[PDB]
Automatic annotation (TrEMBL), chains A, B:
Gene that encodes it: araN
Name of the featured protein: Glycoside hydrolase family 127 protein
Domain Non-reducing end beta-L-arabinofuranosidase-like GH127 C-terminal: 523-635
Alphabetical list of PANTHER family matching this protein: DUF1680 DOMAIN PROTEIN (AFU_ORTHOLOGUE AFUA_1G08910)
Organism lineage: Bacteria, Bacillati, Bacillota, Bacilli, Bacillales
Disulfide pattern: 324-401
TM segment ranges: none
Cleavable signal peptide: none
InterPro entries in alphabetical order: 6-hairpin_glycosidase_sf (IPR008928), Beta-AFase-like (IPR049174), Beta-AFase-like_GH127_C (IPR049049), Beta-AFase-like_GH127_cat (IPR012878), Beta-AFase-like_GH127_middle (IPR049046)
Pfam families in UniProt: Beta-AFase-like_GH127_cat, Glyco_hydro127C, Glyco_hydro127M
Record-annotated Non-reducing end beta-L-arabinofuranosidase-like GH127 middle domain positions: 425-521
GO biological process assignments: carbohydrate metabolic process
Organism: Geobacillus stearothermophilus
Domain Non-reducing end beta-L-arabinofuranosidase-like GH127 catalytic positions: 4-414
Amino acid sequence: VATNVNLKDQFWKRYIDVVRHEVIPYQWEALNDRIPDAEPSHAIENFRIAAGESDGEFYGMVFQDSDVAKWLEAVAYLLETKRDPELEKLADDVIELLGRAQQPDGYLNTYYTIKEPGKRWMNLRDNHELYCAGHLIEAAVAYFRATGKRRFLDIMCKYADYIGTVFGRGEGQIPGYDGHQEIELALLKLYEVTGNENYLKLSQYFIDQRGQQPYYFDQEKEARGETEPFWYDGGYRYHQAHIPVREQKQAVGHAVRALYMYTAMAGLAAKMGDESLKQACQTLWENVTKRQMYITGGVGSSAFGESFTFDFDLPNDTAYAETCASIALVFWTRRMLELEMDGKYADVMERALYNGTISGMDLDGKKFFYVNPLEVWPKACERHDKRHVKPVRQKWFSCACCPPNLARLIASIGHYIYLQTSDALFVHLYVGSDIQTEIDGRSVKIMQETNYPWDGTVRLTVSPESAGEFTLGLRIPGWCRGAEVTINGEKVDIVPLIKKGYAYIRRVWQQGDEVKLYFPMPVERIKAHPQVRANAGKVALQRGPIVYCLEEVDNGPNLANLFLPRDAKLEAHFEPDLLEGVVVITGIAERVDESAWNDELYRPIEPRTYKVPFRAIPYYAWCNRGEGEMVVWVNEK
Amino acid sequence: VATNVNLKDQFWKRYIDVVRHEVIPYQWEALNDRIPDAEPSHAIENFRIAAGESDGEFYGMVFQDSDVAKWLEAVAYLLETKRDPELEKLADDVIELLGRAQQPDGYLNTYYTIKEPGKRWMNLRDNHELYCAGHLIEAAVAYFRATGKRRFLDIMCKYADYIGTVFGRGEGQIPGYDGHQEIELALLKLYEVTGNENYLKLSQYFIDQRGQQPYYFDQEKEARGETEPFWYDGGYRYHQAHIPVREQKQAVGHAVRALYMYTAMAGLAAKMGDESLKQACQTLWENVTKRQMYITGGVGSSAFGESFTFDFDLPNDTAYAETCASIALVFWTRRMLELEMDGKYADVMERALYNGTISGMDLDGKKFFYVNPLEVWPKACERHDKRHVKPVRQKWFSCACCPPNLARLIASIGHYIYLQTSDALFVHLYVGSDIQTEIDGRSVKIMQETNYPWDGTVRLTVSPESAGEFTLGLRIPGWCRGAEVTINGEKVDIVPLIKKGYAYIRRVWQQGDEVKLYFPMPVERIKAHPQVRANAGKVALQRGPIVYCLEEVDNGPNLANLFLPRDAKLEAHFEPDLLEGVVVITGIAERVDESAWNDELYRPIEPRTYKVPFRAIPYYAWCNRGEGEMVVWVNEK
C-alpha cells in the first residue's frame, strides 16, 4: 500500500494543535496524579505497583488501565503528524513499565495482578479484562505504525496469544466473552498489522460466541453464588448478548457497546467476505441511522443504561448522546465503507465528525461533555430526569468516556479521508490534505484544497509519477443536491457515473490534472420524519455537513418561544473572529409577546407576535460563551 | 346550624353511586384480606392483633393504619346521602375494634404496638404516626357528623389529647412535627366539631414549628444513629420543612404534603385572624396556580419525589400529577374561600374537580391511575424516565394514594357546592342539587337545576319559609365571557354586583322566586403563558370547565403528527351514549404525509399535509376505550 496522509487545512489542524498542546499534556498530568485540584487517577501508579516499583493498593475503576492505553493511542497518532522526542520518550517509558507489569504468561491487568489475583476471568460480564486488553492492543498497533518500534506490539501479541489459549470452545477453554465489546475490533487491527491469522480467528470466535445459549454470563454469575437480578430491565440486551449477532436486527442496549460490536462485525464481514455478518451490519445500520440517531450524529436516547430505546424516540432535552457513542459511530462507518462502498456511510461519518463528536469539547480543549443534548434549559437540568445533562462543559473524573477518547479520534482524523483499493482511490472526506500512494503499482500524489465545511468548492490535484488509467471515487454528500465536477475546466456529467453516492471517474490521469468539485451549501430547513414525535412542528438549520443551533447568548432566553417562519429569508456569512472562525446564520424570527399576559397561566388569547433577528451558530461550537439555553430543533411558523 | 345538601344530579350522583356500589365494597374486601388474587392488605388484622384478638405479625406499609381511616371517612359521607344499616353496623364494629386496640394513654398505632412497642415517636420524618392519627381524626369527625355517634370521636379525642402532651415546646415535650403533613388540617376539623381550642393551638403549633433550626429531623436522625444523607437531593424541601412556612414563597417538594400543609395554613389564618399566614397562603396560591399547575388542575411535575419543580416547568409526557395532589388542591381551595371570597379559588376547585381528580378512575370505578399525564405514547412508557406513567388504569395494592382517597372526596361533593355565611348563601359550583339551611334566622330551601357542565344554563329556585332579605352570592366562572341573570324573568344588571368573581344579589326573596343564569359555553382554544416551554406552539381545547383531549381510538396513531389550523371549524355536540353521556368537540386538523421522507430520518423538504376530521373528548374520560395515544396540548399550525 505504501500510503501516507498529511493534513493541510485550518479546521482539523486547529483541533490537533489543541489535542497536542492542551489535551494530551493535561491528561498526562492527571494520569500521574500531579493535578492538586483533581480527584486522583492512579492509572500509571497501578502499573508501577503491578510492576513491583511502588508499594500501595489498587485505586480506581475496574477499567482504569484503558485510560493509559487510549492516551498512548492518541500519542501514537500525534507522533504521525509531528515527531516529538519528549512525547516519544514518555510513551516508550510507559511501554517499558507496561512490559514489566505484564505477567510471564502474557496477562496484563493491574486490578487482578494487585487486588484480586488468581480471581481472573471470573467476571467477564462486569470487569472489563478483555476491554482493557483490546484498548491496549489498539495502542500498540498504532504505536508500531507510527514509530516503527515493536516493543509494545510484542508485549500485546503475548497477551493476545495468551487470551487465545484461554478462550474458546475446545478442551479446558472458557466459552466466554466481554460484557463490553472492544477486543473484537482490536484483534482485527492486530491481525491487520501482524498477518497472524490466529488473531482473526480469536476475533471471529468472540463475535460468533456472543449471545449463544446457555448464556455464558448466567454460568459465570451462578459460579460466583450471585442471585440478584441484573439492574438493566432489558437484561443482556444491555451488552447485546441476548441473541447471536447474526440475528440482531434492532439496535438495543448500551450504545458504545453496540457500536463497538457492529464495527468488529463489519470488519470481519469484509475479511471473510461473509454475507450473514454483512447483512446483519446493514440491517443494524438502517435501524440505527434511520430510526435511532439524532441529527447531530448523536446516539443513545436514555440516560438509564446510556442506551438505545426504540425507533423514532429521540427526545432532545433528555437525550444522552454520549460523546464516545458518536466516536464509536465513526469507527463503524469506516469499517462499513471498507465492506461496501456507499456514500451514506461517509455521510453519517461526516455528520458525527462535524457535530456530535467535537461538540464534546470546548474549542480550547480544556473542558468536555460526556452528554450532548439537543436542547438545554439550564434551570431544568436540576430535574432528576435531566441531571445527566450538565449545562456547561467540565473536567472529568475516571468517568469512562475520558477526554483521550475524543483525542485519539481527532489525532487520527487523516486516516478517515481516503481509502486505497487496488484499482480505485476513494475520497470520503473533504479536507485540506494530501496522500502519497500506489495505484497499479503506480506512485501517485493527490492533493485537496478547500475551505470545507465553510464552503463547498474542492480543488483536487492528481499527480501520478507517470500518466495512467485509474479510478477516482468521489463521495457525493447526501446533504447536497446538485454536486458539480470539472476536470481541467471541463464539465463531467456525473449522473451516469454515480453508484450508491460515489462518482467513479475512470480515465487516463496526467501530472497536474485538476478536478474541481462544487457542492452548493445553501442554508437548509431540516425536517424530521413525522414518526419522530419530538420534532413535530419543528425545524433544524443545517448548512453543508454542519448542524446549527441557537444559544441564549445571541438570542436571549426562552428559545421555545422563538418561531422561525417558513419563508423568512436566511443569510450565512463567515465570522473570522467568532468561535475560531465560523459561518453564522441569521434571519428574522418571531417571538410571542408576554406583556399582554397578566399574571395568568391559561387563557383563550391567540398569540400576538413580533419580529426579532436571530443568529444561529454551529452545534459543535455551543457552550463556549457562557451558560444559557440552546436548541437545535426550533418551532416553526 | 342544621344544613342539608342533596344532589339531584346526573353527573356527580353517578360518581357517588359508583363509589357506593363498586369502590367502597371492593376496598372493604381488600382491607379484610378476602380477595384471593390481590396482595393482602392486613390493615384490619393489624388492629385485631394490637387489640389482642388475633396472633400474628404486623404487615404492610408504615402508614397502613390510615387505609382503614380513609375507608371509614368515605363511609361516613356515604351514610349522609343514604343511610344503610348494614354498612353502618360494619363501621361501628370496626370502630369498637379501634377502641380495643388503643393503648391506655390514648396512643392508637398498630405498628408501634405489635412490632416495635415502646419505640413510638422515634421517626417522625418517615413513619407517618401523626399522619395516620390525622386521618383517623378526620374519619371520626366525619362519622359523628353523619351518624351522631360520638364513640369514634371519644377514641380520637383521647389520642388527640395524648398528642397534645407529647408535642410542643418545653421540657418533657418533643419540638417535632410529621414528615407528612395531615394532622394539622385534621385538628382544625376536630376543633370545628368539638369547640376545644387545645386542638386549634395544637394545629398552630405544628405549623409554627416546622422548619425552625436546628432541624428537628436532624436531631431525631442523630439519635437514631443514622448518618447517610437523605435520598431526595432537595433535602427537607421534600417535606416543606426547609424553612418556616411564613417564609415559603414557592411551592417545593412532595405535592400532596405541600397542599395538605397549605390547607391547614389557610384554615388557621381564618380561625386565628393571622394576617401573616393569610399573606403567605396568598403568595403560595399565586405560585401554585399561576406557575406550577397543569391545565387539568394536576400539580406535580417530577416523579422523583412526586414533587413540584419550579416555575413554568410543566412537561406533559413526564408529568406526575398524582390524583391525591389534585384532591389536596380541592381541600385547599375550599379553605381559601372561607378565608377570602374570590371566584379564583372556586375556579381552580372546579378545574381540579372536573379534570385531574376524576381522571384518576375508570368511569365504572374499578380501576385507577396514580399518575395523570397530559400526553401518552404507550410504547414510550417503557422509558425509565416515564415508567411512572401507566398507560392504562389498574388495581392498586400498596397505594399511599388512591381509591378511598378519591372516594371520600367524591362522596362528600355536596359539601363543596355552597357556603352558608350569616348574611349570605354562596354558590360555588353549578350542580343539580338542593340545600335546606338557615339564613339570618330563616328556614330557606334553594334548588339548582342545570345540565352543567354540558350546558351553561342554571335555574335556582329560592323558597324561604317566610319572605326576607338576604344575599345570594353567585360565582361568575373565570372561564366564561359574560353571564346573564334574570330574576323572575326580569333582567338584572350584574356588572355593579360583581366583586372578585361573585355577583352579590341582595333583595327580599319570596317563595318560588326563580333566578336564571346563563353562561355561554363556546369551544375555546386555550394557550399557556409563553414561559411554559412545554406548550410553545401548542393549544388545548376547553368548553366550560371541561378540558378536552384527543385519543387514538378516535383519531388514529401519532397524535403528535396532528396540527390544528387557525380556523379549525370547531363544533360541539352531545353524545348521550358515549362515555356516560358527554359533549364531544369536532373539527378539521392536518397531518403530515410521511412518504416524502422515503424512509429517511432527516430531510430538507416542504411537507405535503392533508386534512382530517378529528374528535376530542373530556380529559377525565380518556382511557376508557382501550390503550392508546392521548394528548391534551395539540400542535398548532
